[PDB]
Amino acid sequence: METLKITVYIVVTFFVLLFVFGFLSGDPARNPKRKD
Amino acid sequence: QTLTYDDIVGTGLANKCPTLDDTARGAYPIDSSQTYRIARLCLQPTTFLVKEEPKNKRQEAEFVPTKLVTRETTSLDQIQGELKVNSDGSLTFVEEDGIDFQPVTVQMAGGERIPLLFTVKNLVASTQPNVTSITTSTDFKGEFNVPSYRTANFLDPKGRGLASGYDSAIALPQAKEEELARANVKRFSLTKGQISLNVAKVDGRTGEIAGTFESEQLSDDDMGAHEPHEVKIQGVFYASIEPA
Amino acid sequence: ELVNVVDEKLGTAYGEKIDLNNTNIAAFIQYRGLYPTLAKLIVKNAPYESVEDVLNIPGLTERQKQILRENLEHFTVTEVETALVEGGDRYNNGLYK
Amino acid sequence: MEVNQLGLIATALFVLVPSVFLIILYVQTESQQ
Amino acid sequence: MEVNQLGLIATALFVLVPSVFLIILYVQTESQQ
Amino acid sequence: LLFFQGFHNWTLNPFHMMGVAGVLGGALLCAIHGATVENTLFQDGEGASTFRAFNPTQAEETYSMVTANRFWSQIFGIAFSNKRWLHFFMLFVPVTGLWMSAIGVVGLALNLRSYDFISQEIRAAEDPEFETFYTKNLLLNEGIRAWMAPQDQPHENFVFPEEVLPRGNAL
Amino acid sequence: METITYVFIFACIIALFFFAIFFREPPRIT
Amino acid sequence: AELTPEVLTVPLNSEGKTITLTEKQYLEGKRLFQYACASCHVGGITKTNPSLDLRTETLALATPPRDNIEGLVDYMKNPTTYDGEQEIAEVHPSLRSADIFPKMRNLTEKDLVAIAGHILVEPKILGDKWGGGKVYY
Amino acid sequence: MEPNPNRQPVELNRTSLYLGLLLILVLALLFSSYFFN
Amino acid sequence: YSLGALSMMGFIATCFVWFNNTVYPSEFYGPTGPEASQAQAMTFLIRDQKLGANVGSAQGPTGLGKYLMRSPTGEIIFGGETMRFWDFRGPWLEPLRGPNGLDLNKIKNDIQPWQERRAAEYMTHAPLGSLNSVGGVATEINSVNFVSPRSWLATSHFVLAFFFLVGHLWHAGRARAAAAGFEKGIDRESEPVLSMPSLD
Amino acid sequence: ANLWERFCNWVTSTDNRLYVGWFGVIMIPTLLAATICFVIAFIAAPPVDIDGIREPVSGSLLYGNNIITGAVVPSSNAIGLHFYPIWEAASLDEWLYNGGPYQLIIFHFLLGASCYMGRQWELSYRLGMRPWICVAYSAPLASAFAVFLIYPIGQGSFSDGMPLGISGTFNFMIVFQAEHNILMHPFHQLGVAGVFGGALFCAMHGSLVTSSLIRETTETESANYGYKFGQEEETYNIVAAHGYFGRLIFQYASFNNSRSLHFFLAAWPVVGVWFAALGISTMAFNLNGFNFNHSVIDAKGNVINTWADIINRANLGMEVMHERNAHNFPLDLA
Amino acid sequence: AWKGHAVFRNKEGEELFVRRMPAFFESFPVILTDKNGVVKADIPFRRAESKYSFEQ
Ligand code: CLA
Ligand code: CLA
Ligand code: CLA
Ligand code: CLA
Ligand SMILES: CC(C)=CCC/C(C)=C/CC/C(C)=C/CC/C(C)=C/CC/C(C)=C/CC/C(C)=C/CC/C(C)=C/CC/C(C)=C/CC/C(C)=C/CC1=CC(=O)C(C)=C(C)C1=O
Ligand SMILES: CC(C)=CCC/C(C)=C/CC/C(C)=C/CC/C(C)=C/CC/C(C)=C/CC/C(C)=C/CC/C(C)=C/CC/C(C)=C/CC/C(C)=C/CC1=CC(=O)C(C)=C(C)C1=O
Ligand code: HEC
Ligand SMILES: CCCCCCCCCCCCO[C@@H]1O[C@H](CO)[C@@H](O[C@H]2O[C@H](CO)[C@@H](O)[C@H](O)[C@H]2O)[C@H](O)[C@H]1O
Ligand SMILES: CCCCCCCCCCCCO[C@@H]1O[C@H](CO)[C@@H](O[C@H]2O[C@H](CO)[C@@H](O)[C@H](O)[C@H]2O)[C@H](O)[C@H]1O
Ligand code: OEX
Ligand SMILES: [Cl-]
Ligand SMILES: [Cl-]
Ligand SMILES: [Fe+2]
Q: For this UniProt entry, which residues form the secretion signal (chain C)?
């Protein structure tokens, strides 16, 4: 059960990190008009 | 070093019996002139075993080990009663009151859930004669009553019960009743169970005894709808002997 | 065969009188001066082999014995029905209003 | 469970009969020039 | 008669499944130019 | 509504369920089509309040069907590509749903209910541990009937003594 | 057979979703 | 039907002198019962002890009888258990425990009569509803 | 993506429909007794 | 950004007033939802034990304890439906609670009259009531004019926090579209999807 | 371009067949987890002691249920609002008995469906659209939060959340009426006006547009072929449709602006369903529907029944029968 | 076969009459009245305060 807990925590952290760093990766510029 | 509720809460230690240290191999003198009582009898089950029923009549019908599904809700605790000293030197615990029952569900291989009322309700349990001191060889053997797992107001999913509810299967208004009679007539069982408390540790000073138990009783019969299984419960106990 | 023991007990004097061995404590409200004090003592010291055994309860005042004497014609005793006394059901049988 | 003895064929034909009706009509549409 | 409980659906699908397979193939042939 | 639950078990009826899908589907279609048009509008004016940029006599579409189609194809997997079929489907869904619900009520006129599932009743009557949400709802139905019938049907002159009333423990 | 039936229809619906999304008739601008 | 004098005429004592309350007295009693008592006694039941209601026949079998105005007024001064054996002011609202039940502080004898009249008139109005619970709603 | 050139049209003439339906129905007439048993 | 921040704070305050009896004291705001359910179980334990019941050993209809049972980690808690509220902590109840939960010896001997008065008052002032302020369950008759302040404060602030989340979504989407320059709609002369490849 | 730039370009790519995006990197695993555990638990889960009273309710198809009666059963009342993941259980058998799957499914689903809302903003941002489709989806999303999360929080237990099943849904509805009189709550009534109105306006807008389609096809073809995908002209005559509908009622009751029309089509169901969600979410804190029980009284004081008292009689029957073994004390306080 | 007409009587000899099920009701309680409609016997649901059981 502990090994499942560590797996799920690692998995959840990995996906949350992609969401946060991804939205930090110049998101307002990714649009078809003002690519500033 | 004594704990509080905020230390204990949500740790599972509230379902545990208190322990005595390994050093407490002493002995507790039972003065025959003085009366005694039990301030707290705790019983913490560790192993629930259910006897299978091989459809053969003969064969090896042994007790199989099961998996607990109702979590750390299992211990009996805060049990009080009078510890009499008899004529022949034996001590008989008469159980008075406490948290002396817990509904337990365990699950066998194949997924069959077994509900049981794990209990020591109205436990009379006696030692051997000529025990002038509770030592680490003392054995409280005794019997208790196992009332029905559900009480009389309990309604089945079709609204049938003993003291309440329908007396027939209302969804089948014109069915024959004699094949449905074992489900339609709710029956309150009352059976006996046997328990042996084996002392392993004695606090000679305080009067705290601890050890192991083995208890045998019938499981739930679903108010008479099916046969109960035979259950063997094993675990630890703790008792504190206050002189009264 | 199988019988509803609660339904059967309504066929006895339980269905008519207050049964001192079985009936829930709230039925002592039906007569003056039994509830709560005498009702508590009656249920605590049950079972009884006769109604007149209710006067033998230890500690009763003479006023308490006189009240019980005025109400023995409303009492009965049957065998203890385990479906009625288990679960604490004589103190709370799950019925309110 | 003691289910209706005709329920399986009633379900199987309820699917298959209008499903194959649509499959026939679709495939002959694709084979048109 | 106490016949196989699956015999009706086994027969119905034994007919209908390859029959509709041929009906599909025939009708899409006729709709070709 | 409560009468049809307690007596007819009308929620269990597949014709009512088809009506529910038609109503909630039509409300979905009303919300989803209105939002999509309003969010794929062409900039046809300089105002930030965009209602003025529609003229009632224009030949041109006021919103982008192509952009709407690409949005929903990528969000949801499917999308309308034919405006005429889209608006027919908006007719079809709640109209078919209401027609389906009408048929179920025609059955309830004769008490031809979808009240029970027989295989669950056979199992529950012989197995007093077998419980589903369906058997739970029938206990609610039995409560509704016994508690409401004496006042709801005062021509029947129902006297149900208190001990006959189905009740759970305590309540 | 009941459980098989309900799962079968469900699996056919999910298969239909696959073809309706990935093998749809492609919307063509004309 | 009207709230006539005969409806508003309840027993005053255990002997049998009656008191005919005014409609102003009954309506003031209902207001004060709602203010001070209906949080447990709504509809004549008792939420925290359903065994003892406020029906007229039940108050008659109380010791001392509470099925008259003065019996109910004495109960609101010095409440007892149903046999009269214990004094329960420390857990039941009364004039003698107005320091722990502060809604009982500014109750007059005219207020206690009015509440007692409401308890007696209401089952003559509502029948089995008063003290019956949800069965009779 | 360019079309696959290995594709071929499929045919089943009416006589083949009649022959196949004769074969399926007669096989069903034969085996149905055994399916029912 | 402030709209999302306010919506988050309103949802938090909704849970604060509903559960917390420290900064929203029950003497001022009424009992919490958990508190009153715990107080009913306390009321009927006290009454029935006064009648002579052994409340530690009383079995309910299900076989769980009618008054007292164990939580899933084993603490002694009030039985009945209020098993869900065994995390409730209040000053009228905490004197009865030992190291392993509710203490049976404390329950038998040490329940003061002020606790019994508090339990009955909180049970009868449970935060349940109608929009026209009829106290109690939806099936209750008109007499008691009560809706708890906790219910008024939680419901109002749920509504406000929800609509403020909607306002956050509305203004955040609009601010992105306004900064990127398409909040007034799609330019017909440079429609973005028209220069993307087809999905199929 | 490094790997992170190549990765971000793929994630937010408008050329993917289904748009991923940053909300999608949360939406995709959570919804897959919720779906997979749902299908498995719907087919094969053992019975669940939902009411915490050792009385397990069979939800799965393998344990007796059909499509209508089947459900993933809400977690045990003994759990309450406690977080119950798999790793909290001593075994998978214990997790399944206590209704573990329900908590896993609803938490993953509500997280994923929230990210579905953000994904709807995100693609509209990438496509240059206006951003408020996700505001329209906030109406059903709030309703899902209301029945799966907000109602359990107010009542103190995930055992009170809506079960994941057709009959369990009806059980949730009937019990909710018994305890809250939702029919007599104006937010549910506004909700009904939303969905009835939404269905009306769906049929109205559909029929009016279909009624005014410009003739482009012959009799032997579907009229839908008269519309070509991406054509610039509008496919129906809005002036003719306004001329019809403005004469069906009166002229100023009919829209002649298609933008105002389509905003009204968005606004009516969404606001109503928003109010329906706030109905459930505020009945979660027990502010119930209108109680007019015994409101009409004659000159003597006799209760004169109304239709509201008849509703109450039905509510009482639901109340006394629901969870018939779960109550030990006379008030159902949560 | 017809079983014949059932006549129900209490211990006082008075004929009782079983209240018939109306067509609306999937289930219906068993209630026995005298000739003037007053309830004299029933099959109770809750038994604890029952006064009109067939045994009583
Ligand atoms: C998810 C929730 C839900 C939804 C979406 C529905 C949806 C529906 N229900 Mg169901 N219902 C539900 C839950 C739900 N139900 C539950 C839990 C129960 C309890 C079992 C019911 C019990 C129930 C019953 C008893 C009935 C429905 C019916 C219906 C259908 C009503 C269609 C309609 O609009 O009639 C509205 C009425 C009309 C369309 C008739 C014409 C109205 C005219 C045109 C109005 C003219 C107005 C006039 C101009 C002036 C007005 C003045 C104003 C001031 C008043 C619709 C399919 C009905 C049905 O099935 O009908 C066949 C029905 O009888 N439901
Ligand atoms: C945090 C906000 C809040 C809360 C919790 C309360 C709570 C209370 N008020 Mg107070 N009050 C408030 C704000 C609030 N009020 C405001 C803004 C005013 C000025 C009008 C008042 C003026 C006031 C008076 C004069 C009185 C109260 C009273 C009360 C009590 C009884 C309420 C009642 O019966 O409502 C009745 C219920 C309604 C009117 C229905 C409310 C439904 C709302 C409007 C829905 C709103 C949704 C949304 C925001 C609107 C749609 C927008 C959407 C399209 C985006 C209760 C404690 C009474 C009291 O007991 O005093 C001691 C009393 O007499 N209040
Ligand atoms: C209709 C509009 C409306 C109304 C009438 C209310 C009313 C209320 N709100 Mg709500 N609120 C609203 C809209 C509204 N709100 C909206 C739209 C949101 C965003 C969704 C909120 C978010 C919100 C939160 C998060 C909370 C409230 C709370 C409250 C309550 C207390 C308010 C308070 O003290 O603020 C605080 C006042 C200030 C911040 C002003 C400055 C105060 C200074 C710092 C006070 C210092 C005092 C100190 C003792 C000084 C001592 C000096 C010393 C030297 C002696 C009150 C009933 C509280 C509540 O009761 O929750 C249930 C709460 O926690 N509101
Ligand atoms: C339903 C929840 C929700 C949704 C769909 C959105 C959507 C949006 N937010 Mg908003 N936001 C929210 C709640 C939400 N918000 C709340 C409660 C706050 C206050 C804390 C904010 C504060 C906020 C700021 C400061 C900004 C946005 C912005 C935006 C927009 C651009 C995308 C972005 O950067 O968001 C980021 C997403 C969030 C802040 C929260 C989304 C939550 C959902 C559930 C996703 C969860 C993902 C996460 C990894 C899951 C955790 C798993 C857990 C087990 C650990 C987009 C429209 C940006 C913008 O462009 O405004 C003009 C911006 O700068 N939001
Ligand atoms: C074994 C297992 C696991 C079992 C599964 C468990 C389980 C419980 C299964 C569920 C069973 C189930 C589904 C039962 C429900 C069955 C039910 C009640 C049947 C209804 C059947 C019926 C015929 C009803 C009649 C009413 C009717 C026809 C309803 C149809 C409703 C319907 C489908 C509505 C459409 C909803 C929908 C999401 C459409 C979106 C359309 C869309 C892509 C719009 C986008 C869009 C908008 C624009 O505006 C523009 C411009 C463009 C371009 C554009 O794209
Ligand atoms: C025997 C005797 C005496 C006979 C004499 C009879 C006689 C000749 C009398 C004549 C005199 C006379 C008229 C008498 C009056 C009698 C009288 C008052 C009758 C009472 C009738 C009555 C009940 C009133 C009718 C009620 C009624 C229908 C009013 C509701 C109006 C209504 C719903 C308005 C709101 C409209 C609303 C905004 C909905 C929009 C719907 C919608 C989304 C449509 C979509 C849509 C809309 C468009 O707009 C266009 C464009 C398109 C594309 C489109 O999608
Ligand atoms: C709950 C907190 C109560 C409030 C407020 C009031 N009463 Fe009450 N009442 C309550 C209980 C628990 C009991 C039973 C006490 C016991 O004997 O154990 C009572 C009893 C009465 C009675 C006696 C009923 C009988 O059958 O004899 C009466 C007449 C009575 N109460 C009246 C009364 C009045 C007038 C109140 C308002 C001032 C009032 N009570 C408040 C609980 C509560
Ligand atoms: C939750 C844990 C992290 C908490 C973070 C709090 C501190 C935030 C600062 C961390 C750094 C953010 O800094 C951000 O990093 C990314 C990742 O390369 C940079 O780099 C980015 O360049 C451009 C941005 O236009 C993108 O096209 C590209 O894909 C990406 O590489 C961003 O330009 C920079 O703004
Ligand atoms: C329960 C059993 C159900 C079994 C289902 C049976 C599936 C059978 C699939 C048959 C599919 C035939 O597939 C179909 O073949 C025809 C020709 O044969 C193709 O048709 C092609 O050739 C024809 C003839 O040259 C042209 O007129 C046509 O324009 C061209 O597309 C279709 O484009 C293809 O879609
Ligand atoms: O869980 Mn599901 O339903 Ca919400 O009230 Mn309390 O608890 Mn139970 O009773 Mn009624
Ligand atoms: Cl239920
Ligand atoms: Cl309870
Ligand atoms: Fe349109």
A: none
Per the structure block, which two tokens stand in for J73?
């980690």
CA of J32 to the centre of ligand 3 (A): 20
- Probe site for chain B from L21, L27, L43, L50 (most B CB atoms < 10 A): L27
Q: How many residues does chain L have?
A: 56
* Nearest by Cα to J129 from K288, F109, K312, K59: K288
- Is residue J83 within 8 Å of J71, Cβ to Cβ? yes
Is beta strand B230-243 parallel, antiparallel or unpaired with respect to B101-107?
Answer: unpaired
In chain F, whose CA is at the least distance from the CA of B168? F125
Cα–ligand 5 centroid distance for F25 (angstroms): 7
Domain of residue B167, residue span: 151-186
The answer to whether the CB atoms of B154 and K325 lie below 8 A apart is yes
If one residue of D13, D17, D20, D27 were mutated to test the ligand 9 pocket, choosing by the most ligand atoms within 8 A of its CB, it would be D27
Separation of J15 CA from ligand 10 center, angstroms? Answer: 20
Q: Do chains I and H touch, with touching meaning 3 or more CB–CB pairs less than 8 Å apart?
A: no
Q: For chain C, which residues make up each domain, given as ranges? A: 1-86
- Candidates C3, C7, C19, C91, partner chain L, best to mutate (most L CBs within 10 A): C7
The count of C-alpha atoms lying within 13 angstroms of the C-alpha of I3, restricted to the half-sphere facing its C-beta, is 4
E21 vs E5: CA distance, rounded Å: 26
Tokens of F95: 């109209």
Cβ–ligand 5 distance for G15 under 6 Å, the answer: no
List the binding residues of J for chlorophyll a.
153, 164, 167
Q: The tokens 């094949």 sit on which residue?
A: B179
Q: Report the separation in Å between the CA atom of J10 and the middle of ligand 3, taken as the mean of its atom positions.
A: 10
List of long-range contacts for H78-81, beta carbons under 8 Å, 24+ apart: H81/C35, H81/C36, H81/C37
> Which stretch of DSSP H or E encloses residue L32?
strand L31-33
C-alpha J98/C-alpha J78 separation (Å) is: 14
**Peptide bond preceding K74 in cis form (omega within 30 of 0):** no
- What amino acid is encoded at K78 in this protein? A
**Count of domains in chain B?**
2
What are the C-alpha distances in Å from K330 to residues B238, H48, J84, K206, K284? Answer: 37, 9, 17, 53, 21
The technique is cryo-EM
Give me the phi and psi of F13, to 5 degrees please.
-85, 125
Residue after which a domain boundary falls, among B140, B166, B186: B186
C92 and J57: CB-CB below 8 Å?
A: no
Q: Give domain limits for chain H.
A: 1-137
Task: Establish if B235 belongs to a structural domain.
Answer: yes
Tell me the three-class secondary structure of chain G, residue by residue: CHHHHHHHHHHHHHHHHHHHHHCCCCCCCC
CB within 8 Å of E28: residues ≥ 6 apart: D27, D28, D30, D31, I10
Task: Find the CB nearest J116 among H40, H91, H137.
Answer: H91
Please tell me whether residues B78 and B126 are part of one structural domain.
yes
Alpha-carbon span B162 to B187, nearest angstrom:
7
Helices (H) and strands (E) in chain B, counts: 2, 14
Residues C97, H133 contacting (CB under 8 angstroms): yes
- The CATH code of the domain that includes B167 is 3.30.2050.10
Residue of J nearest to C88 (CA): J58
Q: Tokens 């008109």 correspond to what residue?
A: J142
H/E run at residue F135: helix F133-152
Residues of chain C found within 8 Å of residue F170, distances taken between Cβ atoms: 94, 96
Q: Resolution in A, one decimal?
A: 2.1
Q: Name the phi and psi angles at B75, rounded to 5.
A: -75, 145
Task: Say if residues B150 and B113 touch (Cβ distance below 8 Å).
Answer: no
Query: Which residues of chain K make contact with A11, given a CB cutoff of 8 A?
Result: 29
Nearest CA to ligand 5 atom 45: F79
